[PDB]
Ligand binder design. Structure first.
Ligand SMILES: Nc1ncnc2c1ncn2[C@@H]1O[C@H](CSCC[C@H](N)C(=O)O)[C@@H](O)[C@H]1O
Length: 241
């Protein structure tokens, strides 16, 4: 699918055109950075680099970072965004399903953020991806993996979620247990529609346990502009031991 990659490349361009990273950094806060700091983390592998926000935040924070993504095109955008923030990014093109094909080091932590794991629609692929991440971690390593709160949608909810003030709204057009389609509308009128797999919180936790992770703490993460009783995101902190 040539067009589908081009469609998503258009989407991330729009996201970064209209949402500046300083605002996003202020909002995210330093919870993730603090979690890594408290564990004495030095080497981090970003497996979902995208246009590089998480990686650049981590480089800025002083971590040694390897930035991987399945998409060469994303990595080019990430390297240039890093360059613009004054950092040399270490990029590696790699598919989650065979990560150690081109990555030969072990890491203190792996981050898989921005609701990325949701892009896998096959359960075999999910297991493989997690086993690949698990193998890339040092004995005392940690996996940080987030996701949208799909439970809230599946059990109720049919309204838009806004991010960075009203810069973008995210509306669930169709959600069932095998597929969520979101409409993203930006403040300039741009609309993009994206498919993803609606991971239940406990299903993700179960997968992490099943491939070998010893302890998993799931945190509620309220990112949206207009807060509800339920978090719109979950962050899983999975310790290899
Ligand atoms: N199977 C796979 N293997 C490697 N990378 C994958 C993948 N499936 C999706 N990705 C990547 O995961 C990314 C999701 S975008 C996440 C961007 C970043 N984490 C942020 O929060 O801004 C995309 O760049 C996509 O190329």
């Amino acid at each position: 699918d040539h067009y589908e990659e081009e469609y998503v490349l258009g989407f991330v361009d729009k996201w970064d055109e209209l949402i500046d990273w300083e605002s996003r950094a202020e909002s995210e806060g330093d919870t993730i950075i603090n979690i890594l700091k408290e564990r004495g983390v030095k080497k981090v592998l970003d497996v979902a680099t995208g246009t590089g926000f998480n990686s650049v935040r981590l480089l800025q924070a002083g971590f040694d970072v390897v930035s991987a993504d399945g998409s060469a095109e994303m990595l080019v955008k990430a390297f240039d965004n890093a360059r613009d923030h004054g950092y040399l990014m270490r990029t590696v093109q790699a598919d989650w399903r065979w990560m150690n094909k081109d990555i030969h080091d072990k890491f203190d932590a792996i981050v898989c953020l921005g609701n990325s794991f949701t892009h896998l629609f096959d359960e075999g692929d999910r297991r493989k991806a997690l086993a690949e991440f698990y193998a890339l971690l040092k004995h005392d390593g940690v996996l940080l993996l987030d996701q949208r709160n799909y439970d809230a949608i599946l059990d109720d909810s049919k309204h838009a979620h806004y991010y960075c003030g009203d810069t973008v709204s995210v509306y669930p057009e169709h959600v069932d247990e095998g597929l969520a389609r979101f409409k993203y509308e930006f403040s300039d009128g741009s609309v993009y529609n994206l498919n993803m797999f609606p991971l239940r919180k406990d299903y993700t936790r179960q997968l992490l346990h099943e491939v070998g992770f010893q302890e998993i703490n799931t945190l509620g993460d309220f990112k949206e502009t207009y807060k509800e009783d339920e978090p719109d995101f979950f962050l899983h902190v999975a310790e290899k031991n």
